[PDB]
Structure 1
Amino acid sequence: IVGGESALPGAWPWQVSLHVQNVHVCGGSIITPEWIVTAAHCVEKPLNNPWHWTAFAGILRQSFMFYGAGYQVEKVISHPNYDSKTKNNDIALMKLQKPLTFNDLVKPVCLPNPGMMLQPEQLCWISGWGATEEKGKTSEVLNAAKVLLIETQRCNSRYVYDNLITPAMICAGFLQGNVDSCQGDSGGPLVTSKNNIWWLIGDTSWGSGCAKAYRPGVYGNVMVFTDWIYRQMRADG
């Protein structure tokens, strides 16, 4: 997050960070208290054995324990049609063995329903634990930023990406720069305000640097694979 500010302890209970080997790697979002949505590029072959993974939720500053007080991941399911070259369909799910009872600062976000008819230049918020300016370390505190949504047609310009955005992808941020996520902000909740409620309509997969001109933020479109997630519910029980 570049150009943002420190996130005050308000009500943003849809950010769960997945830690492996007692170090922070990426975050995620929750929709129901039985699953965690995250990116699929961090679930590669060297990242197997989901038993050595923990989840942290409702924790602003990442210092409250050491190799304990977490939730173990039971099983991880990645998208079958995932390509590591073009980075398409970057959606992964993780299952926890804990009931995850609702309490203070614990409230998931509902899935976006089809036919939302969102505005092209829609305003959204991004958050995560990444670098500060460029190639920095993991931020100790939680920061947030405000971005705008740009259409896919303008994002496919030859001077920006030269037609490298799949229909299941989207672009957001500012073309002028200074507002972008750096390395480490994988996943991330991209929620928008509508009908006085938040809708998660984004998923960070990759990006060409941060705070750079002609290099906006790239996000995954989960609206096409939302029903696919429902298919995973058929595998629940």
Structure 2
Amino acid sequence: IVGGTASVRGEWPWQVTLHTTSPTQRHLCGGSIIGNQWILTAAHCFYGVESPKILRVYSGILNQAEIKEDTSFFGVQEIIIHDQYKMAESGYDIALLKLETTVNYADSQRPICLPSKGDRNVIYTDCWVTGWGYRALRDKIQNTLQKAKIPLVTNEECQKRYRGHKITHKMICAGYREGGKDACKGDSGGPLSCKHNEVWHLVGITSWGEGCAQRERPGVYTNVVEYVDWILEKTQA
């Protein structure tokens, strides 16, 4: 996260840090808890991953230093990617992780609500992007979960900033005209929490962007409301 602030322990309970054990253990991507055994994340976050056997999901984590050899975690049983996904910039950047064991909800780790086709016209004014991603285009994984409040931008306004791409209605962007705050390398798969009606709703999934926090370069996220049907279809096996 660029231009954000260190979060408070327990603040984003649905946020998870996906680690890889090959060649050595390290933070790969972010994810959101959406079911006792379901993690919603970014499809492109699984590039080069052959077996979920090398995946490790760590819930209720604030600082990466909490993660050691003796730190319990959730193994991955299955990796489900969209059948129409080729790459981040082309949308459908969404994937599900069926955990090998069930998550015991608590103050440190709870699910986030998924938007419904009904609030498809709702306007979220209170949105935050969180992650252990970069603080600058050329930085490194952050130890403490960073957060940052970013405004949403109409797909029309977004499309205007990415004349080289096609911002589909299945994409959602957010950013400041002058930049400053945005997701960055390491935050992919991260959730785009939006509080609406005293409740947090997983609006977008950190997907991609040109550089990081650049002026007139809003961040691009997977428009989760457009995938509710897909998520239901894939979670019922």
TM-score normalised according to structure 1 size? 0.92
Q: Which runs of 5+ in 1 are unaligned?
A: none
SS in 1 for 2:231: helix
Give 1:96's aligned residue.
99
2:98 partner letter: K
Give 1:14's aligned residue.
14
Q: Find the partner of 1:206 among 189, 205, 208.
A: 208
Matched, 1:155 2:187: no
Matched, 1:142 2:145: yes
Matched, 1:106 2:109: yes
Q: Give the 3 Å change call, closer, same or farther, for CA 43–173 of structure 1 in structure 2.
A: same
Q: Find the partner of 1:180 among 171, 179, 182.
A: 182
Give 1:220's aligned residue.
222
| TM superposition shift of 1:133 | 2.5
Greater fraction strand: 2
Q: Deviations over 1:28-61 (max 9, x none)?
A: 00111111111000223x2111111111011111
Matched, 1:229 2:203: no
| TM superposition shift of 1:94 | 0.6
1:9 partner letter: R
Q: Deviations over 1:53-77 (max 9, x none)?
A: 1110111111232275221100111
Is contact 1:4-1:179 (8 Å) kept?
A: yes
SS in 2 for 1:156: helix
Is contact 1:147-1:174 (8 Å) kept?
A: yes
| TM superposition shift of 1:95 | 0.8
Give 2:122's aligned residue.
118
Question: Which is higher, the Rg of structure 1 or of structure 2?
Answer: 1
TM-score normalised according to structure 2 size? 0.92
Q: Deviations over 1:111-165 (max 9, x none)?
A: 111121212x7331111011123310111111110100111112222xx112521
Distance 1:226 1:53 in 2: 25
Q: Give the 3 Å change call, closer, same or farther, for CA 85–63 of structure 1 in structure 2.
A: closer
| TM superposition shift of 1:188 | 1.1
CA RMSD of aligned residues (A): 1.6
Q: State, as a whole percentage, how many aligned pairs show the same letter.
A: 42
Q: Give the 3 Å change call, closer, same or farther, for CA 177–14 of structure 1 in structure 2.
A: same
SS in 2 for 1:155: helix
Is contact 1:123-1:149 (8 Å) kept?
A: no
Distance 1:201 1:76 in 2: 21
SS in 2 for 1:8: coil
| TM superposition shift of 1:6 | 1.1
Aligned residues: 231
SS in 1 for 2:34: coil
Give 2:61's aligned residue.
59
1:118 partner letter: V
Q: Deviations over 1:212-236 (max 9, x none)?
A: 122111111111111111111221x
Is contact 2:28-2:186 (8 Å) kept?
A: yes
Distance 2:135 2:13 in 1: 23
Q: Which runs of 5+ in 2 are unaligned?
A: none
Distance 2:9 2:75 in 1: 25
Is contact 1:172-1:217 (8 Å) kept?
A: yes
Q: Give the 3 Å change call, closer, same or farther, for CA 85–114 of structure 1 in structure 2.
A: closer
